[model samples]
Target: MTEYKLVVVGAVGVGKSALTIQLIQNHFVDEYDPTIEDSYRKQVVIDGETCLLDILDTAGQEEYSAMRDQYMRTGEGFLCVFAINNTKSFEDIHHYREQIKRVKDSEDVPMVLVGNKSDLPSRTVDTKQAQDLARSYGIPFIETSAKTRQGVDDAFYTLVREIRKHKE
Candidate 1:
């Protein structure tokens, strides 16, 4: 019934594109880039509400930092993603979350904490820590793997639901 502006962000090499592509294209890609941005649109039924999902997939490298604030300012919801096996990426979640907070100029915003590449055998970021981070942000935390399609839709759908609830 409505369109939601969703932004995906995280540190580089964190599988952000993989997760976004999985949700948008229904398949996994080995890698992607432009060092700037890519956008996609999809229609889905979330909790019986069919709505348009406009997703902004952003570059993780800080060299493109200038481009971040533009989209972050307009994004209604965000997926603050990190790779479970990469502790550095996990740590960078704070920066992305805070950046959005600063850009939106609001304490409460629709967002989700996503741990991507969950299919990997080794995880450097513990589940509890991720959960605690999500709790601190008052948002949902989901473990996802674009390779196996785990939690791909859940991550996006949850953000949409968060946005809906925030609007109310």
Candidate 2:
């Protein structure tokens, strides 16, 4: 089976683990491990083809920044996550994208811009603003909530699709 190494990245407390677990475990976790990063594997079917996803749910703390480039170098695709309620996390998304580009040495690396925590009623980052940025980068933009499992599958599935296209 084809295997894809996908990395979930963003600023601290942006719900990276929540989104990852929601897709792999089919549930939400209110508490997450901040110091230790988790790597999960799951077999899935996308577009009628079976594949295994090697997902790295990264630690957001700056103290663990040493391994960032190593993972970014090996990752086939990325989910650049941000919390919709926090504008600063949304702003940090660009930095992650740029770092990934520098690590991969390519401007058109396979990636999806994810604005998470859509279930929250208080949203500071406008959907249109995210859409515009994703458009400029020529990548898909998806809003998701790990609690309700909204758009959770689409985010991961879409990243896999992007990796397929990037392979060609």
Candidate 3:
């Protein structure tokens, strides 16, 4: 079986857990957004088949900084997220991406730089600027909000597809 390993790395309050657990049941009879509880392994059903999603949800803190290197070594792809309300976290995303490359020892890694909490009106991050940073590194950038449950699944789905892209 081909399993996709995704590691979500971002500064705290960027909704890393929310984005990972957030689900949309638009596939079948349910057209509503489903916010799933925290589970490292999230099973995504597509076309009546299961796509295994294995995730390593890491903690955010200075003491936990070294843990990312460990996760990167085992993960197939990554989601570097920053909260839209905090520019510091947004600025830190660049560091997050670089760390992944450094630890993985590969420049052509599969990653997506995400700006989360887009539903809030206090966002200071300019969407274009965030996109520009990802463009500079040739990585995909996405905006997501867990409260409104918009674009949350998109980022996660993008990660799965990114893994497939690299596998091919």
Q: Say which candidate scores most in lDDT.
A: 2
Clashes of each: 0, 0, 0
Error of 3 at 130 (Å): 0.8
**Model 3 alpha-carbon drift over 4 Å, by segment:** 24-39, 46-49
lDDT of candidates 1 onward, in order: 0.77, 0.79, 0.68
lDDT of 2 by residue, 73-143 (tens): 88877777888888898778767767777888887787777777877888888999989988887877887
- Which consecutive 10 residues in model 2 have the weakest lDDT in total? 28-37
- Residue-wise lDDT of candidate 1 within 141-161, one digit each (tens)? 887777777657766666676
Clashes of 2: 0
lDDT of 2 at 16: 80
Off by over 4 Å in 2: none
Residue 68, candidate 2: C-alpha displacement in angstroms: 1.2
Q: Indicate whether candidate 1 or candidate 3 has the larger lDDT.
A: 1
Per-residue alpha-carbon lDDT of model 3 for 79-145, expressed as tens digits? 6778888889966765765777788888788877777778789869888888887788888787776
RMSD of each: 1.7, 1.4, 5.3
